[PDB]
Design a protein around this ligand. Structure first.
Ligand SMILES: [Zn+2]
Ligand SMILES: [Zn+2]
Ligand SMILES: [Zn+2]
Ligand SMILES: [Zn+2]
Lengths: 115, 15
């Protein structure tokens, strides 16, 4: 479509040349669907999450849709993987999940790849 | 764990 990644971070307004929160250059990551961008540290991503989100068509929080069913319904039930940030409805998982776990939850794609 | 809802609430600086 008409998407172009924004050249500034939604959080600190800096470009990739200078994160205004950290005072260091830092690449931006950009939503594949809407083009909004953020510095990974402004997005509060770990370094390994930062690498992961650059490997697929990462979506921002607002655009995130479930990998399994494709919808963005039921925000309260759309889990975000703590290793790759992909979204999965708790009710699209099999077995489905009643409540977000405590501490990290990671998706089946990451379990397959890293373990 | 994070959901879209809890992630929105803890990342309040996003434009
Ligand atoms: Zn930033
Ligand atoms: Zn987006
Ligand atoms: Zn789903
Ligand atoms: Zn994952």
């Amino acid at each position: 479509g008409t998407v172009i990644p924004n050249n500034y971070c939604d959080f600190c307004l800096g470009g990739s040349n200078m994160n205004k929160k950290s005072g260091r250059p830092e690449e931006l990551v950009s939503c594949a669907d809407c083009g909004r961008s953020g510095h990974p540290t402004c997005l509060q991503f770990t370094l390994n999450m930062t690498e992961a989100v650059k490997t697929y068509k990462w979506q921002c929080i607002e655009c995130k849709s479930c990998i399994l069913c494709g919808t963005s319904e039921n925000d309260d039930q759309l889990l975000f993987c703590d290793d790759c940030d992909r979204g999965y409805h708790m009710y699209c998982l099999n077995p489905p999940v009643a409540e977000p776990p405590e501490g990290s939850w990671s998706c089946h794609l990451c379990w397959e790849l890293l373990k | 764990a994070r959901t879209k809802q809890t992630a929105r609430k803890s990342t309040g600086g996003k434009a």
